[PDB]
C-alpha cells in the first residue's frame, strides 16, 4: 500500500562482480603433464586492490581421476583471514567474444590461504584438442570467468517518520532560471554576433572566474553596458547563459561541439564536463579525428583519454576515413600521441602479436 | 580486465652443417664422435653443439643409431624444452624418424637428447631411399619454452565524473563575498550589502517594491526595521543559497519574518520546525503564532493537538489568554473538535 510503515530497513548483501581474461599461445605445444605447475598474474578485483587471486590450469589433469581430462583450478594468493566464500564459474570465450560453455559453482566455496578451488575435470582432453569445435584460433585457448566475492552482511535501519508537513522542494534554480528568461532587474548588456543579451555581473562573476576577472578590471566603472564577445555564436551562447543562471543544460546534445568550445573559452568547469560526457557518448568511428581535435584544442582531459581510448581500439577502419589524413597533415603532434597511446598498451611489444 | 596472457614466446634459431662420408666413418675412425660447437640465440650467449654418431656408443645401442643432442652448457637451470629438431626435406623423411615427444629439463653442466634414432642396418640398406648424396643435412631448431612471465593490462573505462551542480554554495559564498552589490539593505542601524535581482527572484515582497517607480531614492536606502539583524540575516542566507541552518532554534521570529516578505518556501520550513516542538504549555501561543501569520499547516496541527490534549491544556495561562484575546481561535477549535469528529454513545 506504500503507507511508509514508520519504520524501515534496506540490508544490502553486497556482492562485488568483476572478471579475469586469459589467452595462453599455442596451447597444443604445452604439454604440462600430471600436475606440472604454470600460473599467472595475480588479479584482483580492481576495485581497490585487497585480494589476489591467480588462475592454475593443467593441460594434463593431475592424478589418475582426471588423467584424460583437464584440469583448472582457481587459487587464492593473499586475502584477510576470514574464511573467504566466494563464487567462481568458468567458461571458454570463442573467437566472436561470446561465451559457449558455462560451467557455474552451485555455492560459494571457502578459501583461506594456500587453498585453490576449482572445477576438475573441467573439459575432456579428446573433446579440447579437437579443433573442429572451432574455439582454438591459431591454437589459442581463452579464459573467461565471472565471480562474486561477498562480504557477509551490512544492513541498514530506520527511520523516515512521520512528517505530517509538506515543506515543497527548494525552487532556487526554477524561480532564479525565471530571472534570465524575463531578464528583469539586469543591467549590462552583452552582445554576441550582433544580437544583444542582457545579463548582469554578480551570478556570472560567481559562476565563471574569466567574466569575475574581466568585468572587475575597470571596465564596469565606464563600459559596464557593452562588452566584446564575438567568439562564439548566439544559439549556443542562449544555453551557456541559461545553464549559468539556472544550473541546467536542456539542449546539451545538438550543441555539445560548440558548447565545449565556449565553456573552455569562459572555464566553466561543470559545463565543460557535461559538454564531454554528452559527446563522449556520440564517438563513432567516422568522427573520431575530429573529437580528438576538439579535446586536444580545448584541453578536455576526459574526453582525449577516452577518444585515444576508442582510437586504440578501432584503429582498424579509422585510418582510411580523411579525417586522419588531414590530422596528420596539420597535427603531427596528435599523431604523435596516438602512436603512444596504442604501441604501449594493447600490441606493445608484439604480446600480443 | 588483466590481460595476464602468459606470453609463451619461444627462442628459436636456424643451423647449418654437413656429415661428409657417412657411408665409411665407421671403419674409418669409429664411434666417439667430436663435432665442432657453435654459438647462439641472445647474442651467441647461448652454447650448443650437434653430430651424428654412426654407431653406438655403447654396447647395447649397438642396434640402433643414436643421434644425441649434446649439450655441455644450458641457457637456464630450469629449461623445460621440448626440443623438436628437423630437416629441410633433402628427401622426403618426416616421419617414422624418431621426433621428441617429451623432453627432460636442461641443467647446468647436463647434457640430455635421445640415443635411439634409426635401426643400423635398415638405415645402411640403400634400398629404403635414405641416402641423399650420402650426405644428410642438419637444421636444428631449438625450441626452449620455458619463458612465460608475463604482461598484464587493467583496461578500465569508468566512464565521468560529472560532478554535482553547486549553485546553491556559489550563492552563497557570493552573498558572503558581497561582490558587485546594486542595493544596501539597513536594519536596526547595521548595513548589509545585497543583489537586487536575486532577492526580486526569490522574494516576492522584495520584487514589487523595486516596480512601483521608486527606484531613484529606495535602491540604496531602503528601510528594514521590523525585522531584528539576526533574523533578518538568516532569511538572507536563505534567500541566497536556498538553506535554513541556524532555523531550528529561532523559529517564530524567522515565521514571522517569513510571512512578511511571502517567502513561502521558508515559511513551511519554519511550520516545520514549529510543529513538531509543540508542548501543553505553549500549544496556545503555537496556534495564536500560526493563526496571526496565516500558516495553515501549523495551525491545523496545533488544533488538533489542542483538541487530543483537551484536558491538560485548559489549564494552561495561554489558552485562559486566548480564550480573552483571541475567541474565533476557540471558535475553530471547536469546530475541529465537534465537526470533525463524533457521534460518541451519548
Not at 594434463?60 to 581421476?65: C, S
Given at each position: 500500500s506504500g503507507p511508509v510503515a514508520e519504520s524501515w530497513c534496506y540490508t544490502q548483501i553486497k556482492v562485488v562482480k568483476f572478471s579475469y581474461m586469459w589467452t595462453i599461445n599455442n596451447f597444443s605445444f604445452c604439454r604440462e603433464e600430471m600436475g606440472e605447475v604454470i600460473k599467472s598474474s595475480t588479479f584482483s578485483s580492481g576495485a581497490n586492490d585487497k585480494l589476489k587471486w591467480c588462475l592454475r590450469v593443467n593441460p594434463?589433469?593431475?592424478?589418475?581421476?582426471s588423467k584424460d581430462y583437464l584440469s583448472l583450478y582457481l587459487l587464492l594468493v593473499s586475502c584477510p583471514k576470514s574464511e573467504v566464500r566466494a563464487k567462481f564459474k568458468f567458461s571458454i570465450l570463442n573467437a566472436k567474444g561470446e561465451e559457449t560453455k558455462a560451467m557455474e559453482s552451485q555455492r560459494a566455496y571457502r578459501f583461506v590461504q594456500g587453498k585453490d578451488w576449482g572445477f576438475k575435470k573441467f573439459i575432456r582432453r579428446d573433446f579440447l584438442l579437437d579443433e573442429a569445435n572451432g574455439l582454438l584460433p591459431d591454437d589459442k585457448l581463452t579464459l573467461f570467468c565471472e565471480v562474486s566475492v561477498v562480504q557477509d552482511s551490512v544492513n541498514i535501519s530506520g527511520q523516515n517518520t512521520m512528517n505530517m508537513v509538506k515543506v515543497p522542494e527548494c525552487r532556487l534554480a526554477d524561480e532564479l532560471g525565471g530571472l534570465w528568461e524575463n531578464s528583469r532587474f539586469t543591467d549590462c548588456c552583452l552582445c554576441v554576433a550582433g544580437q544583444e543579451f542582457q545579463a548582469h555581473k554578480a551570478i556570472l562573476a560567481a559562476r565563471s572566474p574569466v567574466f569575475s576577472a574581466m568585468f572587475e578590471h575597470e571596465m564596469e566603472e565606464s563600459k559596464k553596458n557593452r562588452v566584446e564577445i564575438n567568439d562564439v555564436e548566439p544559439e549556443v551562447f542562449k544555453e551557456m547563459m541559461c545553464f549559468i543562471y539556472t544550473g541546467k543544460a536542456p539542449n546539451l546534445d545538438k550543441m555539445a561541439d560548440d558548447l565545449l568550445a565556449a565553456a573552455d573559452k569562459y572555464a566553466l568547469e561543470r559545463l565543460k564536463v557535461m559538454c564531454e560526457d554528452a559527446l563522449c557518448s556520440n564517438l563513432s568511428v567516422e568522427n573520431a579525428a575530429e573529437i580528438l581535435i576538439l579535446a586536444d584544442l580545448h584541453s578536455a582531459d576526459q574526453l582525449k583519454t577516452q577518444a585515444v581510448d576508442f582510437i586504440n581500439y578501432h584503429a582498424s577502419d579509422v585510418l582510411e576515413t580523411s579525417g586522419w589524413k588531414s590530422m596528420v597533415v596539420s597535427h603531427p603532434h596528435l599523431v604523435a600521441e596516438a602512436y603512444r597511446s596504442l604501441a604501449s598498451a594493447q600490441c606493445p611489444f608484439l604480446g600480443p602479436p
Open positions: 594434463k589433469g593431475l592424478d589418475e581421476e
